[PDB]
Amino acid sequence: TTSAGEGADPVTTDASAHGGDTRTTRRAHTDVTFLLDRFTLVGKTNDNKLVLDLLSTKEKSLVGALLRAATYYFSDLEVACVGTNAWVGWTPNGSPVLTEVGDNPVVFSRRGTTRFALPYTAPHRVLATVYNGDCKYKPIPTTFNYGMIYTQAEVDVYLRMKRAELYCPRPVLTHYDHNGRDRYKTTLVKPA
């Protein structure tokens, strides 16, 4: 179909012009909520502390990449610290940094991992993955966090976004290197 592309109005076509059909599609796997609803490893704690910042997610992982594909987002959160450690503790967004959690929420370990559920605690209606605040581009606020955890020992930290909502899509780039080759190619799983 010819069209006046300048106006930017969407155009989506079948194969019917050429005599074709349309297959039945089931896009369950491209559902945003489903996609982000899994645990992603963000790394290890530091002095047995870790600020819960979704921007800590590895940017080439499925979750890190998708989260960054949106300008704004909202979600609740689940945490799981795996490692040999006794107890993970937590403080909400806006609390002063402490020397010891003592009395704030504390959860004891069970068979080497501590997993628990948290609520969105920011003071904003939604958070952003980018924020052009005083950083004049020429050709992230304190508040953007989900609290902080305190642990008894070093552990691997995993975050899981629950009830996720994304707004204003942003680019998602391929991360494999073509080298000089035209096609990309790798070894895919095959019977040995």
């Binding site: 989506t12 050429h18 297959r23 790798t186």
Partner: protein
Amino acid sequence: TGPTNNKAKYMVAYIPPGTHPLPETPEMASHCYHAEWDTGLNSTFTFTVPYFSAADYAYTYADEPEQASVQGWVGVYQITDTHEKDGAVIVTVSAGPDFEFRMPISPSRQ
């Protein structure tokens, strides 16, 4: 993107796998699923790249031992142009109405 007085006529075809000498001429390529269109009032033309395969699903990645494209090729040809001073054609791609992805994977790293 060309000026008003520069006219051309194009064609795009879907070449199925195993086709031998990939056609290099409009004449030969006309034997494939194709579309021809010319310039005029409407600047944009949209083409539908179909899905043919033995299987219902294809892989997004290419196995190391894969010499030819298991899914074939798409060839874009210029049948003719008034003026040899270029007229740029911006090419763009979007999902069709029945496109679908399955099996999420975190292919992570190096």
